[PDB]
Design a protein around this ligand. Structure first.
Ligand SMILES: CC(C)S[C@@H]1O[C@H](CO)[C@H](O)[C@H](O)[C@H]1O
Length: 459
C-alpha cells in the first residue's frame, strides 16, 4: 500500500473535515441589549428573556441547510452563562426567562440529539464579568473555568467541538489551557478543539486569520504551531498555512450570515445573499477548510426566515451543481498508474474508499478524460486522500474541443493545494476531452475525486 507523506490528520480531524459545514449560534444576554455585539458583563441577568425559545426550530433550519453540526455560545466574553452553573449567579438562573428555571444549553443539546446533529460548545476564555471581581486572579479564574468546563463536558451528552476564542485571552498561559485540555480530552475523546494563541499545543483546528469567510489560496492543513500562538504576526501562516509546517492543524473558517455575530432586527435586510454564501462556501469548504456559519437567534429565540431561506437555497444549489459529475462515461488514459486497484477511473466512481494513485517516487501524472459527447462546464472539484498527507503541490486542468489544441483554464492553472477538497469556478467552456495535470508534489499523487460540473441556476 501507499505510505503517508509528512504529517497526517487524526481521527478527530478526519471526522471534522467530513462535516464540511458547521453552524454557529451566537445567543445570550447581548441579544436582549440594544445593538450590542460585545457585552461588558454589567447587563442585569434579568433582561435575558426569550419569549418562546425553540431550539428545535434551529435544527430544522440546519436540516434544510444540510448542516450536520452546531456550536452554541454557552458563554461569550460578557460572562453570562446559558446553563444554570453551580459556580456563578451570572447565568439563566437569575434571568426573567422561565423565572430562572431554564437551561438553554440543555434545550440545545436535546434538540441536537433529537435531530441527529453533532453538538459543540463555545465557552469564552476571556471573561469580562469575572474580571469585575476585586478577587479576580488568572489562577482562580483557571479553576472557575475548569469547573464550568467540567459541567458542560459531563452533564450535556456527547460534545463534538469545544471553541476557544482568542479575543482578549492573551493573559491566559499554556498551563491554564493544559488544565482545560485534560478535562475535555478525558471526558470527551472525540471532541475537536478549536485552539487559538496560548492553547496552540492542544488545538485540533486553527483560525485562518479573518472573519470574512476566506481561507488562503493555497490553504495547507499544516502550519507552524508558533503561527497560532503569535497569531497577530502570522496572518499568512494561519490563512495559508505552511507546506513545511511543524503541526497538522487545519483551518476552520468562521463567518456570520449577517454583518454582526449577534442578532439585530436592523440587519434583517443585510443577510448575505445565496450568491455570497456560495462564494464563501467556495473560499472555505472549497479551499481545504471547513465553514463555520453563524445564525444568530433573535429575542423570540427563533432563527430568522431570511437566514433560513438563504442557507436552504445554498444547499439546494450545491446539490444541483454536484449531482452530475460530467466526466462520467469518459474513456480514461493516464501516465503514472500504480495499478488497476488505483486506476484513474477511481476518481469518477463516487465510492468512499477508492482512489487513483501514482507509483512511488513519481510525483507527476497526466490524466486524460475523453468524453462520449462534448460537454459544457463552469466548475471543477478535486479531492486528495488526506489520510496520506499533503502529496500534490502543483496541478492544472486543460481541455480541448478539436482534439489537437489543449487550451488552459486560467482559473485552474498552476494551483498548489488540494487537500480535503478544492473547488474552482471558471468561465463556461465546451470540451470533448479534459486533461488533469499533476505537475509537482512531495510524493506520488493519491486522489479520491475529480469532476467537472455545471453550477446551479440558483447561483
Ligand atoms: C480580531 C478579532 C477577529 S479577534 C479573533 O477572533 C478569531 C475568531 O474569529 C479568533 O478567535 C482569534 O483568536 C481572535 O483573536
Amino acid at each position: 500500500s501507499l505510505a503517508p507523506c509528512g504529517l497526517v490528520p487524526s481521527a478527530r480531524q478526519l471526522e471534522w473535515y467530513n462535516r464540511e459545514m458547521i453552524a454557529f449560534f451566537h445567543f445570550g444576554i447581548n441579544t436582549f441589549e440594544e445593538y450590542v455585539n460585545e457585552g461588558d458583563g454589567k447587563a442585569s441577568t434579568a433582561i435575558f428573556n426569550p419569549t418562546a425559545l425553540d431550539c428545535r426550530q434551529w435544527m430544522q433550519t440546519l436540516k434544510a441547510a444540510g448542516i450536520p453540526a452546531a456550536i452554541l455560545t454557552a458563554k461569550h466574553a460578557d460572562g453570562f452563562c446559558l446553563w444554570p452553573s453551580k459556580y456563578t449567579d451570572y447565568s439563566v438562573k437569575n434571568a426573567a426567562w422561565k423565572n430562572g428555571k431554564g437551561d438553554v444549553v440543555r434545550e440545545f443539546v436535546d434538540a441536537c440529539e433529537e435531530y441527529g446533529l453533532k453538538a459543540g460548545i463555545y465557552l469564552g476564555p476571556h471573561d469580562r464579568h469575572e474580571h469585575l471581581s476585586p478577587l479576580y486572579t488568572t489562577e482562580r479564574y483557571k479553576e472557575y473555568y475548569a469547573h464550568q468546563l467540567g459541567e458542560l463536558m459531563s452533564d450535556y451528552g456527547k460534545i463534538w467541538e469545544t471553541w476557544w476564542d482568542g479575543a482578549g485571552a492573551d493573559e491566559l498561559t499554556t498551563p491554564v489551557y493544559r488544565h482545560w485540555y485534560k478535562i475535555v480530552r478525558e471526558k470527551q475523546p472525540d471532541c475537536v478543539i478549536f485552539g487559538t494563541k496560548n492553547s496552540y499545543p492542544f488545538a485540533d483546528v486553527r483560525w485562518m486569520g479573518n472573519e470574512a469567510g476566506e481561507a488562503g489560496d493555497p490553504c495547507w492543513a499544516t502550519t507552524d504551531s508558533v503561527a497560532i500562538r503569535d497569531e497577530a504576526q502570522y496572518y499568512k501562516g494561519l490563512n495559508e498555512g505552511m507546506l513545511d509546517g511543524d503541526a497538522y492543524i487545519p483551518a476552520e473558517t468562521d463567518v456570520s450570515i449577517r454583518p454582526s455575530w449577534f442578532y439585530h432586527a436592523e440587519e434583517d435586510s443585510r443577510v448575505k445573499s445565496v450568491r455570497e454564501l456560495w462564494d464563501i462556501y467556495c473560499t472555505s469548504v472549497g479551499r481545504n477548510s471547513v465553514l463555520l456559519l453563524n445564525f444568530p437567534p433573535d429575542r423570540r429565540g427563533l432563527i430568522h426566515s431570511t437566514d433560513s431561506l438563504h442557507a436552504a437555497l445554498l444547499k439546494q444549489g450545491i446539490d444541483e451543481t454536484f449531482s452530475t459529475n460530467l466526466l462520467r462515461g469518459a474513456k480514461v488514459k493516464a501516465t503514472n498508474v500504480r495499478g488497476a486497484k488505483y486506476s484513474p477511473e477511481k476518481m469518477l466512481d463516487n465510492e468512499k474508499n477508492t482512489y487513483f494513485a501514482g507509483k512511488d517516487g513519481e510525483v507527476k501524472a497526466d490524466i486524460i478524460f475523453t468524453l462520449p459527447k462534448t460537454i459544457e462546464f463552469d466548475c471543477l472539484m478535486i479531492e486528495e486522500v488526506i489520510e496520506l498527507g499533503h502529496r500534490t503541490t502543483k496541478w492544472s486542468v486543460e481541455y480541448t474541443v478539436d482534439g489537437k489544441n489543449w487550451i488552459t483554464i486560467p482559473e485552474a492553472t498552476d494551483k498548489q493545494a488540494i487537500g480535503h477538497k478544492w473547488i474552482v469556478r471558471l468561465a463556461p467552456v465546451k470540451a470533448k476531452q479534459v486533461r488533469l495535470r499533476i505537475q509537482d508534489g512531495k510524493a506520488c499523487p493519491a486522489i479520491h475525486t475529480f469532476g467537472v460540473y455545471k453550477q446551479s441556476p440558483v447561483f
